[PDB]
Paper text:
Phytoplankton blooms produce large quantities of beta-glucans, such as laminarin, a soluble β-1,3-glucan with β-1,6 side chains. We cloned and examined the genes encoding FbGH17A (locus tag: FORMB_24720), FaGH17B (locus tag: FORMB_24740), and FbGH30 (locus tag: FORMB_24730). The data indicated an enzymatic functional cascade in three steps: The exo-acting β-1, 6-glucosidase FbGH30 removes the glucose side chains from laminarin. The endo-acting β-1, 3-glucan hydrolase FbGH17A degrades the remaining debranched laminarin into oligosaccharides.
Residue numbers in the entry:
A (entry chain C), B (entry chain B), C (entry chain F): 38 to 430
The structure:
């Protein structure tokens, strides 16, 4: 029934979701198309999904779709974490950006989020104020924590005064460093107040990206060369998992140091199945369906043992994200392909019949590579070999 | 019994052999060590082997080893193609090379070859005058065809006079181009006389090397990108086989144009299982145990259907060949590892029990990768993708 | 009008032609589509075209199209050089190539070429036996000159016997080196006989390609750096023209040395307007519409002053030639784009109204870049700067 009951409870697995099927978000998916996705995710035991803005129709249409499916079937159950997108002044225009001022359009985006939580209170269990909106590298739109605090407080006040349910949880979904787990430049009074104001912290961590941008944890190191190729991948991927755990834990340590006790949940993490830039064959050798599956399963095990939700990125490949370059890793974060093929990670579920009778865009849910593990393994590369310096410890 | 009976007869499979186990040929293998190898090869249906010089003790010791095994077991059968190494003047010294004069040491090398054919006429069926000794790129030692002709004619004269068996076959083992199948620069009078003088032509062809030095045949081309990874390798490797066939056939065409009918046999070809230079991960993606197996089997099928012997390169990895770089492809041409592990190509024979009871240096004959095909496939890379131009044919 | 009247006569400008509009030749253009092209070329003063094979329907359909247009308009005039494609044994199969034997399919290709010259003797003025079929780098299909000679002689015998007009000219269209103007490896008896058997020599020369493969002529050298950009391009492009002239003249010198007098015509040369490989921004800086125009005009001036035809490559961009890579230079040799836009070279003619009322695939003949020379010039790069050594002459 409530966010407190759902989050951290492995009977309600979370996922990040977008239902766009073409190279532009101008092509909005229809309610019928979104219902296809909902049925597929529901069959997999996904019970809560996450969304990014309320400016385009997409989020509103997902709620309509879920409502229709709940009317068709009284046992159908899907919940939503609704994202209200937050911008700095002049974001997405040709005018000079100001990261110390807010977009005049944040107010109406918060208003539209509120309206949706009110029309669909049986589905909407969380509002997230911003998506990576405080991280200092989000050059196109980032804001100061004072702006997120402002809107989180606005939402907490609407709950106090009775315009929103007292059980509706408010958060902001952001990088670990924005929540205080990294550079101490972020450790400002406004962040402390924000950590007080939210009901929980939605934290993002991305080892896959750091296989390029901070690669110290990524490789085959020393004696590992003498191990089996299978074992080398297992060990390397385990380091990737532990790296994420460290970043999450760093946020927990920060909040403990402020004398604040709040739940932490993973709002975003993922590992793409293909890259023609930094993360694939021409760079760090991270991206393929096998390593994606390993990462997904490690993240599930960790989060279910720690009682954290993980809104894993992402349900379906979304080819609008790097529109002019289809091989870009942004287009390959799905557990399924755009056409509804199940990647290695979900082959086991296809075999058990979990998606029987279900369709995406006319296609049945088929295994990628025709379920041929050997054909996948030929395409998989090993992580790069590195040498380790021994410290005199 | 005779070379004419053995060559081109698939009941007598050929191989190129060296028994050195260390990074220098100064460490001669013992007779006991060589017997280990002979037993292994014999178990595999190898019945004739090839050797490169008679200067070091190695070839003489192999003959001693085979003799001991034939005394122990009346059904043991192994034959030898003995290589007499030919040099140009000042080869392997610090004096100026002269490729139009011969080394003074050739004479005694030919004498030693003759002495061995005489002491072991039941084993030695062929003498080869030179190994790639005419090919113009063998900068360290190459000679003109007049010098090979000279020694071939010397050996044919010893046969005529009765000092050697009339059934002993004489050849020279050389690159396809040296035998007239390539640049017409080679098409000189002395080569025509050499082709007349030999009993047969021992021809080398190396697609693996040409994956770097002449790569037009090597890759995944056009529409092939849409095929399965398994199929892509099969197609690419088939082009490699066909390339070798074309080079061998080019020699057959050249001798036919001279009005000469001689048998042709493959004296050398091979595909290494590892390379840290041009042929592996840092270059053409040719070298691994899977592609080696594909090449070996294709060469066996082709040669057995064409009634050619193939002295396939090579039985065992020999780590002295690129002594200062163990990852060099020269050290990885074996069907077995230096420690006696059977590479992918022979896994099937290990499972049938062909090598049971047999040992190399104390080790039983084990499968590489623990016989785990998946582990191998992770290490295998695909050939590079290439541009296909369509001609208006 | 006879081949003798047409070739070398600037009242009958020549061009290489294909009418394919899609990325595969499986999509044959219709007779209606081909008529569109013929009208466009005719408006430009093109009076003879060249074709590459008579296996696919394309060449036959061009003849049908020209015939229809001659029936519609008694002043319409278009002639054809018909290419009979010649292959070596196993070309375009997965079997081993043999460049010393011929394809079993050559005979019927020659038969189909003779049938077309017979059904359309008012249009077909030349048969060309082969297209680059002797050049030793055409690895996929090349043949020995004996094979071309065989079929040229066959055709000359059909003319003698009266099955073909005595005024029909026979040739082979090939690289300057194949005709004896380069490596003397080509200087064999069968070539001399071929030079005697043909009515003329159709010679190909490609400076554009040599800006990568033999770049000694290509660049901005020494003092030229101080010159205007406009002038640096003019000087460099003049060297490209003179390079082609030298290659053509080298063929003329070779036939003179044999005491043979035959006309020489340029069967193929061209300069692509775009390249994403060796010839554009990522390599030699050759390819753009400005340098193409300069080359085209230089080749026209040279050929018209020397009384040579130039079957310039090519009328329209043909995107099937490098099907899997649309930025490949093979797809950009047109004077027009696939959509019927006139590249820089023909802007002047669009302005004079030469193509008024004419259409390709529904589109009028428009200028590329909207006829904005400045917009073109921004995209054009200068040739690379090179080291000039002064000799002591
Ligand atoms: Ca030469």
């Amino acid at each position: 029934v409530t966010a407190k009951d759902i989050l951290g409870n492995s009977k309600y697995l979370a996922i990040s979701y977008g239902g766009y099927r073409k190279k532009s978000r101008d092509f909005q998916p229809s309610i019928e198309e979104l219902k296809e996705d909902m049925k597929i995710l529901h069959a997999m035991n996904i019970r809560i999904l996450r969304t990014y803005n309320v400016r385009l129709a997409h989020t509103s249409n997902i709620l309509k779709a879920i409502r229709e499916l709940k009317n068709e079937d009284a046992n159908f159950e899907m919940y939503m974490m609704v994202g209200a997108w937050i911008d700095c002044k002049n974001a997405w225009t040709d005018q000079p950006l100001n990261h110390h001022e807010e977009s005049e359009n944040n107010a109406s985006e918060i208003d539209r989020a509120v309206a949706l939580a009110q029309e669909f209170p049986d589905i909407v269990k969380v509002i997230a104020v911003g998506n990576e909106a405080m991280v200092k590298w989000a050059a196109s739109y980032f804001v100061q924590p004072a702006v997120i605090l402002k809107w989180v407080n606005h939402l907490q006040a609407l709950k106090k005064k009775g315009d929103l349910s007292k059980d509706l949880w408010i958060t902001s979904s952001d990088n670990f460093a924005s929540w205080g787990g990294g550079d101490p430049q972020y450790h400002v009074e406004d962040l402390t107040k924000l950590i007080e104001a939210v009901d929980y912290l939605s934290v993002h961590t991305y080892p896959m990206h750091d296989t390029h941008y901070n690669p110290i944890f990524w490789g085959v190191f020393g004696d590992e060369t003498e191990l089996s190729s299978l074992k080398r991948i297992d060990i390397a991927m385990n380091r990737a998992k532990t790296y994420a755990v460290s970043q999450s834990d760093s946020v927990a340590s920060y909040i403990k140091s402020l004398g604040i006790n709040k739940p932490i949940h993973i709002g975003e993490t993922g590992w793409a199945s293909f890259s023609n830039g930094y993360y694939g064959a021409k760079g760090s050798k991270a991206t393929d369906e096998y390593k994606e599956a390993i990462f997904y399963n490690h993240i599930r095990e960790w989060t279910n043992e720690a009682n954290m939700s993980c809104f894993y990125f992402e349900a379906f490949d979304e080819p609008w994200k790097d529109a002019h370059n289809s091989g870009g890793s942004e287009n390959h974060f799905g557990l399924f392909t755009v056409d509804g093929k199940a990647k290695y990670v979900l082959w086991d579920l296809v075999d058990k019949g979990v998606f029987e009778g279900l369709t995406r865009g006319g296609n049945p849910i088929t295994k990628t590579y025709n379920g041929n593990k050997e054909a996948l393994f030929l395409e998989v590369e090993l992580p790069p070999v590195k040498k380790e310096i021994t410290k005199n410890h």
